[PDB]
């Protein structure tokens, strides 16, 4: 938790600061994904209508098992995050 592991993961500097990861629960396990970019997340390519993107974390989802396990991971990597409590 106190460890600055970001210097060994090799991730770019933007993940530590400018990105936000949501810890949600879709029905028995928790997931982590990054919120979309302000602009440049999806622009229509003017050639063939392809869904272009500059966000490299759009396709990434991590399947966890327990809530505290996910929170442990987010603190370990030095990730900004928030937790969405599912409705009962």
């Amino acid at each position: 938790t106190d460890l600055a592991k970001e210097l060994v993961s090799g991730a770019p500097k933007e993940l530590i600061t400018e990105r936000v990861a949501r810890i949600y629960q879709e029905t028995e396990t928790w997931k982590i994904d990054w919120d979309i970019l302000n602009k440049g997340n999806r622009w229509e390519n003017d050639l063939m209508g392809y869904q272009s993107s500059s966000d490299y974390m759009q396709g990434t989802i991590l399947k966890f098992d327990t809530r505290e396990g996910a929170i442990r991971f987010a603190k370990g990597q030095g990730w900004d995050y928030y937790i969405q409590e599912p409705k009962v």
Binding site: L47, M48, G49, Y50
Partner: protein, 192 residues
């Protein structure tokens, strides 16, 4: 009972006569010194090697003459993607997006809506032939045989832009190669 008493196995038992015999010495050679020297000095095996090569000089080469002749093809050949069409003229494709899901290389791009007549069709259908792997799941996934791979391979293009097939290009091939696709399907019907 096994050899577990001695911590051994029938597997660990090498076959009878596994160990090598004693190697020969110079006095235990069948061919005399002169016999070995003649083969050695006169190049007996090389000259035999030359003769066998000369045998092939008087045989018919396998070469065929492209493009005046082609090699064989099979009805299952996977080549140029093509969008088929009903005899009545209406498109076979009803826009499952089964196409976009199976495609291992994600080379299929489909967008669809209700047509004017209301029958479900698609207005966008693009294949990135530079991204496709000619896997064949196109043809297998169709519940109406709308997308099939023709036996064509000679469609190399100067500019890479020409390799992005939109719907009209796929429909043009579907008409242009229709009779050939009839050969392929009607010769592969029993095995599917």
């Amino acid at each position: 009972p096994t050899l577990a008493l001695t911590s051994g196995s029938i597997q660990g038992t090498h076959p009878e006569g596994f160990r090598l015999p004693r190697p020969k010495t110079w006095e235990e050679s069948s061919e005399s010194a002169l016999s070995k020297a003649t083969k050695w000095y006169l190049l007996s095996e090389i000259f035999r090697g030359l003769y066998i090569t000369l045998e092939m000089y008087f045989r018919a080469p396998y070469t065929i003459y492209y493009p005046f002749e082609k090699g064989p093809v099979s009805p299952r050949f996977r080549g140029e993607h093509a969008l088929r069409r009903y005899p009545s003229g209406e498109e076979r494709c009803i826009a499952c997006k089964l196409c976009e899901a199976v495609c291992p290389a994600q080379a299929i791009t489909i967008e669809a809506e209700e047509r004017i007549d209301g029958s479900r069709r698609t207005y966008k259908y693009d294949i990135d032939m530079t991204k496709c792997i000619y896997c064949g799941y196109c043809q297998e996934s169709c519940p109406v045989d709308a997308i099939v791979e023709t036996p064509n391979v000679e469609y190399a293009t100067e500019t890479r832009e020409e390799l992005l097939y939109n719907k009209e290009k796929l429909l043009a091939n579907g008409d242009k190669w229709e009779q050939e696709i009839q050969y392929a399907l009607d010769a592969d019907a029993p095995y599917r």
